[PDB]
């Protein structure tokens, strides 16, 4: 049996390397923080202990970089918009018939809601993502926005 285990263990180690390669292809595809977080959830029960976890550690760093770009991009849209909202110009962030005051609050809410969805997802990830210095830099940016 011990010999039959070693044969089966080798086949599994070959299989776990093919899975890790398929996950990396599938992650290099979606190209959206949402689409990628959805992929993980499918394999959340299908993590093969440490061999997948070694791949996830690299994957976790890429997600944090993606959320910075969106967060930075929203900030740049907010600053440009904020000027137009207060001004009440034609072609403003305010969408169709709203009040010039309530429209701002609904606009601001829509941005605030966009940023807040990934954070509630990031909290669910394990492997001490909070302890990583990269995550801490994103949270500090988020708070200021």
């Amino acid at each position: 049996f011990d010999d039959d285990f070693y044969e089966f263990r080798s086949k599994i180690k070959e299989l776990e390397r093919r899975l890790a390669s398929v996950i990396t292809q599938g992650f290099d595809d979606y190209d959206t923080i949402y689409g990628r977080f959805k992929l993980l959830d499918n394999f959340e029960g299908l993590l093969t202990r440490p061999i997948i976890a070694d791949e996830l550690e690299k994957k976790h760093i890429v997600l944090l970089e993606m959320y910075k770009q969106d967060l930075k991009q929203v900030q740049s849209i907010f600053l440009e918009g904020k000027q137009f909202v207060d001004s009440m110009h034609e072609n403003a962030p305010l969408f169709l018939n709203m009040p010039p005051i309530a429209g701002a609050l609904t606009w601001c809410k829509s941005l605030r809601d966009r940023i807040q969805e990934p954070i509630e997802k990031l909290a669910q990830l394990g492997q001490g993502i909070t302890e990583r210095e990269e995550y801490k830099d994103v949270q500090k940016l988020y708070t200021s926005i």
């Binding site: 595809d29 979606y30 949402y34 969408f95 169709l96 609904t106 829509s110 966009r114």
Partner: protein, 154 residues
């Protein structure tokens, strides 16, 4: 239940292949309802597309369904267009975010694959799903002034 709030019907979609039964209605809050008219009870609001996950961040300004495949319909809410299926609650394909909001968007009557969005930035942008699902097929500046509507020749 008991919580009844009256929310503004921002878009309406109706097709021959869907039939006179279904009327697909988009709202200000971001949800999409379906009103099946009956000769029995004067009206019924059957399905609730994106009560939970699919909720758009702004009002659903345009809905449309492909003439080739009427099961599949897209709704062009806020920054990001989405695509749905005629029973399911949550959207099948979310397509990116964009520079500024989206005012309108429609399928090609001829071709099932490609559908055209128009941004309030000024640009039109085309998503041809036959070739690529990740990026835009081609974008095109129409005017420096925003784009409030698109329509395509059937």
């Amino acid at each position: 239940g008991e919580n009844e709030e009256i929310i503004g019907g921002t878009a309406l979609e109706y097709n021959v292949e869907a039939g006179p039964s279904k009327f697909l209605i988009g709202t200000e809050s971001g949800s999409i309802l379906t009103a099946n008219k009956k000769l029995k009870k004067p009206v019924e609001i059957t399905t609730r597309y994106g009560l939970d996950q699919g909720r758009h961040l702004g009002p659903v300004y345009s809905i449309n369904r492909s003439n080739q495949n009427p099961k599949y319909f897209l709704s062009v809410g806020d920054w990001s267009c989405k695509i749905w299926v005629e029973d399911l609650k949550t959207p099948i394909i979310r397509t990116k975010y964009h520079g500024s909001y989206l005012s309108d968007g429609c399928w090609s009557p001829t071709r099932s694959g490609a559908f055209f969005l128009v941004r309030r930035d000024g640009w039109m942008d085309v998503w041809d799903y036959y070739y690529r699902q990740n990026e835009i097929a081609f974008s095109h500046k129409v005017s420096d002034s925003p784009l409030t509507c698109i329509k395509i020749n059937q």
